[PDB]
């Protein structure tokens, strides 16, 4: 329960001020008939307008503080999610993560805000009502403070039941969200197969799983509401039974037990409401179980280094690199990789489907850590470089490039520290060949591209991706199946970029493609099959050495 | 308006129990102070076995009567709105799947999931904390209006105009700020979806700090709207109480018309001061429900949005020849009109031969394939399948006979068998293994654990690009279609596999339309169509 108090510690100054106003309002509402002032009587007018100002002031501070707490908590959860490793984002889908961040944080904050106000109101009300109990009748205040802990036994035992039902409900809410977003993201494919009823049945399966638990949270509340109001009746009646005996057998204080009766009933009323909070506290613990697991989870990735050299060259060395995917170990995707990249030289990686060419590209971008030998960049390992500096020097395209839903000038310049200059954007688009069709758009670079690039053609989404990677002046360039469906002007621009550009000596390029025209001109060709390098050398040497590469090129 | 009444209508049997458990609940709690006064006033002198014990016994039964019926109220209220919220969410999602393909272009996926999640809870959590207050307040004002009243009700005349214009201007302001709160939440939810779904692009550039900062700006805009909503409500409550003091003093200003005595006037002053500040709860709570229901009209507009699709088909032949004819088709996309994409295409497809459609990027080849699958309606001319319009065929019949493979396929999360047999109500493993052999997908299937029942991540994230394409070809081939459309099918595959799969017409009774980027890709097609800038040569 103490884990929930971590998020409230940032606003202890404002909460303490609200606590002082709570005490003043509670004291004034109790010692009000004690004075009664001892145009005939404007006493009620000044009393009400004073009790309304303090109510408005106290509500303003509490609402502002609760707004600041909720906004701060949601930001910290999303920050801790994005800090985790790449394998974490594969075990949990995007539907689950959105539900934990957006739904669970709002549910926990709403439950905490509505309960903290009336808990502090009735704690100081019960404490101030108890202070007027010790002097009204001393002998009857000890019997009601030893029977009071007997009522806490049942909520303590059944408290675990509430949070066990809550973790299953939040799990079912997240699973239904994942079904909805996955269907809506791929609507043209769903309609093309006429599978609207299949998605409806999948959504209805999750909703009926919610219903079989939400009945159990309705019977539980009805049972709890009985036992939290019968114990209150047993406390208030049992005082009268002992009180009746003291009148006729004990002292002659029957005129003093009269003032105890009214205060006992109001004290009982404060206890029952204060006892109706504990099931809601355990409900809030169950709702926030998952997001509190994300917050303190240590990522299984090495931390960012501190080295940031001014002058760097693209000398990448592989030294017996073997990698197996973390979600399925002991199946070596790579085996004994050993090759070097040098500046000004283009290396072409070719092979059948499923060889592991895209796995090598993922390793070179520090997405995964190899389980074998070292992977050195300029003589130093990849985790020793700063996070924002390593990904500036090393840039890639990807097999299926992704474009975000904003303007193209904000898409080519994505990720850049600072904000690149406009001419820069046009310079990269001209170099990548995308400037031919950008100028054909009515608004130019201001055309907000829709989600998943629906308004963009086939080869256009790879021309923007090529321009995005080239705008940061990378030291190592990776082309992952980008030059397969490019236009004639873009293909000529790629050939000039790879083999005829003046800045060719500045960077080292790793080329992964099936286009034999670009492969035949590469300085080094590596054949990858089964996770190991089969043959290596130039295009002429591979033809002369005969074998695997010869059979692939001579298939047509 | 009246939609929520019909919506919760199949919950009336549980509802009518709630007002049943409420009437005898408030009845019990109003009579408890009477028997409480019965016990206390006899502590000056009491008899041990006499009605003092009966007073305690009578008081405890009415504690039993009120508390038991109160627990059943909350249990009925807590369950019945789980039923309302889950029914709203199902009707919204079912009606969201019938919309046209252009509707999903205008709205983002994160925004749609936000209203499906956040807005349905708001539209169901309105009365719970207040319907107990509403009818209890209705009971008390009924009970209290049964003393000295020569002109007591005069106060009844002054209690009708509670500055209704001030209530109307507050109601407009409250529904206004509740609308911007929902919009700002939806904008923040889209930020989370964009950053999390495309993580590999975000991590590749080291731009995690940008996505965190964008969410922090979105959270601050929501927070300023939350504080504004709370501020005007607290400002309105303070203003309302000041007027309650004003009308109370003004009514008592005429309190000396006869000075019936002083004691009679002061007897009802406490109860009058009560209902003066207790009838304001009625106008506040009723105004809240009216504004809160109308503050979630974006959900109700989605549930009753009529798509611009044509009338549903009813034709279903038992034997389809497979002839496709385009007759002067002119098409322009509905979200971006006044710019034609296709202009006067005219060709015919025959089942015995293979037709190749070639052209540069941005020419409209995939628009032809999308129009052929009845995904869009041409703005001029028509497309005919077997001498009939393609929109007259049944939705579940046409898409089972005419299948296609997209440029980049998307595979839903689940087993490989579920992806291969997607869209089919039943498919034996004999058919699935037969189709996997045709697409040469059985080579890598055996390497995985559990065989064909292994998991595949979202959008096929746990597969290679070449292996994803082979599953898409096997998915289309398992339906046994009559017209097959191949839109850049053999690109991601290697040289060896794409040469093996080049005939596509071994049976010879299927219409095959192969779409290629270059003319050199296709060499065995009987009819070759060259499509330039959206106009056939
Ligand atoms: N996320 C993943 N989890 C588990 N296995 C994976 C994952 N991604 C790929 N694999 C497996 O790794 C092997 C090769 O994957 P990879 O994507 O690197 O292939 P590739 O040769 O680069 O592909 P292609 O040339 O077809 O695009 C295959 O057996 C594939 O199933
Ligand atoms: N959602 C959309 N809104 C507006 N125009 C679209 C949309 N989707 C596609 N288009 C237009 O249709 C064409 C898509 O077909 P196209 O890209 O030519 O396929 P291919 O290039 O493979 O032949 C593009 O020219 C594009 O302008
Ligand atoms: Mg790949
Ligand atoms: Mg196309």
Full 3-state SS string of A335-346: CCECCEECCCCE
Residue A302 has what DSSP assignment? P
Residue B387's domain spans which residues? 324-536
Residues A361, A255 share a domain: no
Q: What's the CATH number where B224 sits?
A: 1.20.1560.10
DSSP per-residue codes, B347-401: EEE-TTSEEEEE--TTSSHHHHHHHHTTSS--SEEEEEETTEETTSB-HHHHHHH
Domain contains A304: no
**Nearest alpha carbon to residue B459 among B472, B443, B444:** B472
Among A321, A332, A333, A363, residue to substitute to test ligand 1 (most atoms within 8 Å of Cβ) = A333
Q: Which atom of ligand 1 is nearest to the CA of A480?
A: 27
Q: Do residues B453 and B415 lie in contact, with contact meaning Cβ atoms separated by under 8 Å?
A: yes
State whether residue A257 sits within 8 Å of chain B by CB: yes
Residue tagged 């979202």 (tokens): B458
The upper half-sphere exposure of residue A79, i.e. CA atoms within 13 Å in the direction of its Cβ, equals 13
Among B309, B344, B372, identify where a domain stops.
B309
CA of A365 to the centre of ligand 3 (A): 14
In 3-state terms, what secondary structure has residue B258?
Answer: coil
Between CA A177 and CA B109 the distance in angstroms is 12
CB B14 within 8 A of CB B73: no
Measured between alpha carbons, how far is residue B347 from residues B323, B325, B529 in Å?
Answer: 11, 6, 9
The answer to whether residues B455 and B403 touch, using CB atoms and an 8 Å cutoff, is no
Closest-CA residue to A550 (of A531, A513, A523, A525): A525
Residue B445's alpha-carbon distances to B439, B441, B463, in angstroms, are 12, 7, 11
Q: Which residues of B touch A244 (CB under 8 A)?
A: 46, 48, 52
SS3 percent helix, strand, coil of chain B, rounded to 5, is 60, 10, 30
Number of domains within chain B: 3
Contact between residue A480 and residue A365 where contact means Cβ atoms under 8 Å apart: no
Tokens of B372: 């052929």
Same structural domain for residues B32 and B162? no
Cβ neighbour number for residue A418 with a 10 Å cutoff: 6
- Interface check for A481 against chain B (CB to CB < 8 A): the answer is yes
Q: Is residue B20 part of a domain?
A: yes
Nearest CA in chain A to B409: A189
CB of B446 within 8 Å of a chain A CB? The answer is no
- Using an 8 Å Cβ cutoff, are B43 and A137 in contact? no
Kindly state whether residues A409 and A541 are assigned to the same domain: yes
Ligand nearest to the CA of B493: 1
Task: For residue B516, give the chain A residue with the closest CA.
Answer: A485
Where is the domain boundary, A260, A295, A330? A295
Check: CB of residue A390 under 8 Å from CB of residue A410: no
Q: How far apart are CA B507 and CA B482, in angstroms?
A: 11
Distances from the Cα of A356 to the Cα of A290, A293, A365, angstroms: 35, 34, 15
3-class DSSP state of A252 = coil
Closest to A431 in 3D by CA, of A380, A367, A474: A474
Q: What is the dihedral of CA A116, A122, A126, A128, to 10 degrees?
A: 90
DSSP summary character for residue A321 = B
CATH of the domain at A526: 3.40.50.300
CATH number at residue A213: 1.20.1560.10
A346 CA from centroid of ligand 1 (Å): 23
* Tokens at A253, concatenated: 């204080």
CB A532 within 8 A of CB A335: yes
**Domain range for A198:** 12-33+55-295
Whether B249 is in a domain gets the answer yes
Where b means 16+ CB within 10 Å and e means fewer, B447-458 reads: ebeeebebebeb
Is residue B60 included in any domain, yes or no? yes
Query: Atom 15 in ligand 2: which residue has the minimum CA distance?
Result: B364
Asked whether residue A305 is domain-assigned, the answer is no
User: Is A149 domain-assigned?
Assistant: yes
- What CATH number corresponds to the domain at position B431? 3.40.50.300
Please give the Cα distance from A466 to A429 (Å, whole number).
9
* B405: enclosing H helix or E strand: strand B402-405
Q: How many domains does chain A have?
A: 2
In a domain, A63, yes or no: yes
Edge-to-edge order in the sheet of strand B380-385: B342-349, B324-331, B380-385, B388-389
Of residues A309, A186, A406, the one with CA closest to residue B207: A406
Q: Does residue B308's CB lie within 6 angstroms of at least one atom of ligand 2? A: no
Say whether both A286 and A383 belong to one domain.
Answer: no
* Interacting residues of A66 by C-beta distance below 8 A, sequence separation 6+: A109, A112, A113
Q: Are residues B90 and B175 in the same domain?
A: no
- Using DSSP's 3-state secondary structure scheme, residue B36 falls into helix
Q: Are residues B50 and B182 in the same domain?
A: no
> Shortest CA distance to B345 belongs to which of B377, B382, B308, B313?
B382
| Whole-Å CA distances, B14 to B8, B74, B369 | 11, 12, 52
Separation of alpha carbons A502 and A222, rounded Å: 79
Distance of alpha carbon B497 from alpha carbon B435, whole angstroms: 16
In 3D space, the residue among A373, A378, A380 whose CA is nearest the CA of residue A338 turns out to be: A373
Which of A262, A402, A457 shows the shortest C-beta gap to B198? A402
Residue B98 contacts A where some CB pair is shorter than 8 Å: yes
Round to whole Å and give the CA distance between B41 and B36. 9
Closest residue to A458, CB basis, from B204, B361, B497: B361
Task: Tell me whether residue B452 is in a domain.
Answer: yes
Q: DSSP H helical segments within A352-403, as ranges? A: 357-364, 387-393
Distance from CA of B239 to the nearest CA of A (A): 10
HSE value, Cβ hemisphere, 13 Å, CA-based, for B387: 2
**Residue A395 CB: number of other CB atoms within 10 A?**
23
**Chain mean position to CA A287:** 15
A353–B198 CB contact, under 8 Å? no
On whether residue B175 sits in a domain, the answer given is yes
Give me the sheet containing A380-381, strands edge to edge. Answer: A340-341, A316-318, A375-377, A380-381
Resolution for this PDB entry, in angstroms? 3.2
Asked if residues A351 and A528 have their Cβ atoms less than 8 Å apart, the reply is: yes
SS3 A521: coil
Same domain, B293 and B369: no
Indicate the residue of B48, B395, B494 with minimum beta-carbon distance to A353. B494
Question: CB of A189 within 8 A of CB of B406?
Answer: yes
Asked if B360 contacts B534 with a C-beta cutoff of 8 angstroms, the reply is: no
B475 and B385 share one domain: yes
Cβ contacts (< 8 Å) between B249 and chain A: which residues? 42, 45
Domain C-terminal end among B309, B341, B365? B309
Nearest CA in chain A to B500: A555
- On whether residue A48 sits in a domain, the answer given is no
Indicate whether A264 and A356 sit together in one domain: no
What is the C-alpha separation between B195 and A523, in angstroms, rounded? 38
Domain assignment present for B138: no
Is B205–A414 a contact, with Cβ atoms under 8 angstroms apart? yes
> Which position has the token pair 């909720």?
A70
Closest CA to B112 of B92, B133, B131: B92
In this complex, is the C-beta atom of A487 within 8 Å of any C-beta atom belonging to chain B?
A: yes
Q: Is residue A157 part of a domain?
A: yes
**What are the structure tokens assigned to A270, written together?**
């404060």
């Amino acid at each position: 329960v103490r884990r929930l108090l971590g998020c409230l510690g940032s606003e202890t100054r404002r909460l303490s001020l609200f606590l002082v106003l709570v005490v003043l309002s509670s004291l004034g509402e109790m010692a009000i008939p004690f004075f009664t002032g001892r145009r005939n009587l404007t006493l009620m007018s000044i009393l009400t307008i004073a009790s309304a100002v303090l109510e408005f002031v106290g509500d303003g501070i509490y609402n502002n503080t609760m707004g600041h707490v909720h906004s701060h908590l949601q930001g910290e959860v999303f920050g801790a999610v994005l800090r985790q490793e790449t394998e974490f984002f594969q075990q949990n889908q995007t539907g689950n993560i959105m539900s934990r961040v957006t739904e669970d944080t709002s549910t926990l904050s709403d439950s905490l805000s509505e309960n903290l106000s009336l808990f502090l109101w009735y704690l100081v009300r019960g404490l101030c009502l108890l202070g007027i109990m010790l002097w009204g009748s001393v002998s009857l205040t000890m019997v009601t403070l030893i029977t009071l802990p007997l009522l806490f036994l049942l909520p303590k035992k059944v408290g675990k039941w509430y949070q066990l039902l809550e973790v299953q409900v939040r799990e079912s809410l997240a699973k239904s969200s994942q079904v909805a977003i996955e269907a809506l993201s791929a609507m043209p494919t769903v309609r093309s197969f006429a599978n609207e009823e299949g998605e409806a049945q999948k959504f209805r399966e999750k909703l009926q799983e919610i219903k079989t638990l939400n009945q159990k949270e309705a019977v539980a509340y009805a049972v709890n509401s009985w036992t939290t109001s019968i114990s209150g009746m047993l406390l208030k009646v049992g005082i009268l039974y002992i009180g009746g005996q003291l009148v006729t057998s004990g002292a002659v204080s029957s005129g003093n037990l009269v003032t105890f009766v009214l205060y006992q009933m109001q004290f009982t009323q404060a206890v029952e409401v204060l006892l109706s909070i504990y099931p809601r506290v355990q409900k809030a613990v169950g709702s926030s179980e998952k997001i509190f697991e994300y917050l303190d989870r240590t990522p299984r990735c090495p931390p960012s280094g501190l080295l940031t050299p001014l002058h760097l060259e693209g000398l990448v060395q592989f030294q017996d690199v073997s990698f197996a995917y973390p979600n399925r170990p002991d199946v070596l995707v790579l085996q004994g990789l050993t090759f070097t990249l040098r500046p000004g030289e283009v290396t072409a990686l070719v092979g059948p489907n499923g060889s592991g060419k895209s796995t090598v590209a993922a390793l070179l971008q520090n997405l995964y850590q190899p389980t074998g030998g070292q992977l050195l960049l300029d003589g130093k390992p990849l985790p020793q470089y700063e996070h924002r500096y390593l990904h500036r020097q090393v840039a890639a395209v990807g097999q299926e490039p992704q474009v975000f839903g904003r303007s193209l000038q904000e898409n080519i310049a994505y990720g850049l520290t600072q904000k690149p200059t406009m001419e820069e954007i046009t310079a990269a688009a001209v170099k990548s060949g995308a400037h031919s069709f950008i100028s054909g758009l009515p608004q130019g670079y201001d055309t907000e591209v829709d989600e998943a690039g629906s308004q963009l053609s086939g080869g256009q989404r790879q021309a923007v991706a090529l321009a995005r990677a080239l705008i940061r002046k990378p030291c190592v360039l990776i082309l992952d199946d980008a030059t397969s469906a490019l236009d004639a002007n873009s293909q000529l621009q790629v050939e000039q970029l790879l083999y005829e550009s003046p800045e060719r000596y500045s960077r080292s390029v790793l080329l992964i493609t099936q286009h034999l025209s670009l492969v035949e001109q590469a300085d080094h060709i590596l054949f990858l099959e089964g996770g190991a390098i089969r043959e290596g050398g130039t295009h002429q040497q591979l033809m002369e050495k005969k074998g695997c590469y010869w059979a692939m090129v001579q298939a047509p | 308006m009246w939609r929520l009444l019909k919506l919760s209508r199949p919950d009336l049997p549980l509802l009518v129990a709630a007002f049943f458990f409420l009437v005898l609940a408030v009845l019990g709690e109003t009579l408890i102070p009477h028997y409480s006064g019965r016990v206390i006033d006899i502590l000056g002198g009491d008899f041990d076995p006499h009605a003092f014990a009966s007073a305690i016994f009578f008081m405890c039964l009415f504690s039993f009567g009120s508390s038991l019926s109160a627990g059943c109220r909350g249990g009925c209220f807590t369950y019945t709105m789980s039923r309302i919220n889950l029914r709203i969410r199902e009707q919204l999602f079912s009606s969201l799947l019938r919309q046209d393909l252009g509707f999903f272009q205008e709205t983002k996926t994160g925004e749609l999931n936000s209203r499906l999640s956040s807005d349905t809870t708001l539209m169901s959590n309105w009365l719970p904390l207040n319907a107990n207050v509403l009818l209890r307040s209705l009971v008390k004002v009924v009970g209290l209006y049964g003393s000295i009243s020569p002109r007591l009700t005069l106060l009844s005349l002054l209690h009708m105009p509670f500055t209704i214009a001030a209530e109307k201007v507050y109601n407009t302001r409250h529904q206004e700020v509740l609308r911007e709160i929902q919009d700002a939440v939806a904008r923040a939810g889209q930020v989370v979806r964009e950053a999390v779904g495309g993580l590999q692009t975000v991590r590749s550039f080291g731009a995690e700090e940008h996505e965190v900062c964008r969410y922090k700006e979105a959270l601050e805009q929501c927070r300023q709207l939350y504080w504004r909503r709370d501020l005007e409500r607290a400002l309105y409550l303070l203003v309302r109480r000041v007027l309650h003091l004003g009308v109370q003093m003004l009514m008592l200003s005429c309190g000396l018309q006869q000075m019936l005595t002083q004691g009679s006037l002061l007897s009802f002053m406490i109860y009058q001061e009560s209902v003066g500040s207790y009838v304001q709860t009625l106008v506040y709570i009723y105004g809240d429900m009216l504004s809160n229901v109308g503050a979630a009209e974006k959900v109700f507009s989605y549930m009753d949005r009529q798509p611009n699709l044509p009338s549903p088909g009813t034709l279903a032949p038992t034997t389809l020849q497979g002839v496709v004819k385009f007759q002067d088709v002119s098409f322009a996309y509905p979200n971006r009109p006044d710019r034609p994409v296709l202009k006067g295409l005219t060709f015919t497809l025959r089942p015995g031969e293979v037709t190749a459609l070639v052209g540069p990027n941005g020419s409209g080849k995939s628009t032809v394939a999308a129009l052929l699958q009845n995904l869009y309606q041409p703005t001029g001319g028509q497309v005919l399948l077997d001498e009939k319009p393609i929109s007259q065929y049944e939705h579940c019949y046409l898409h089972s006979q005419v299948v296609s493979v997209g440029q980049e396929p998307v595979l839903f999360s689940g087993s490989v068998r579920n992806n291969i047999a997607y869209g089919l109500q039943s498919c034996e493993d004999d058919k699935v293994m037969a189709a996997a052999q045709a697409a040469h997908a059985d080579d890598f299937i055996q390497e995985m654990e559990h065989g064909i029942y292994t998991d595949v991540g979202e959008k096929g994230s746990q597969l290679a690009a070449g292996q994803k394409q082979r599953l898409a070809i096997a998915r289309a081939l398992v339906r046994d279609p009559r017209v097959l459309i191949l839109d850049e099918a053999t690109s991601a595959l290697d040289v060896q596999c794409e040469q093996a799969l080049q005939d596509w017409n071994s049976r010879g009774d299927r219409t095959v339309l192969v779409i290629a980027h270059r003319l050199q890709t296709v060499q065995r097609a009987h009819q070759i169509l060259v499509l330039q800038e959206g106009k056939l040569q």
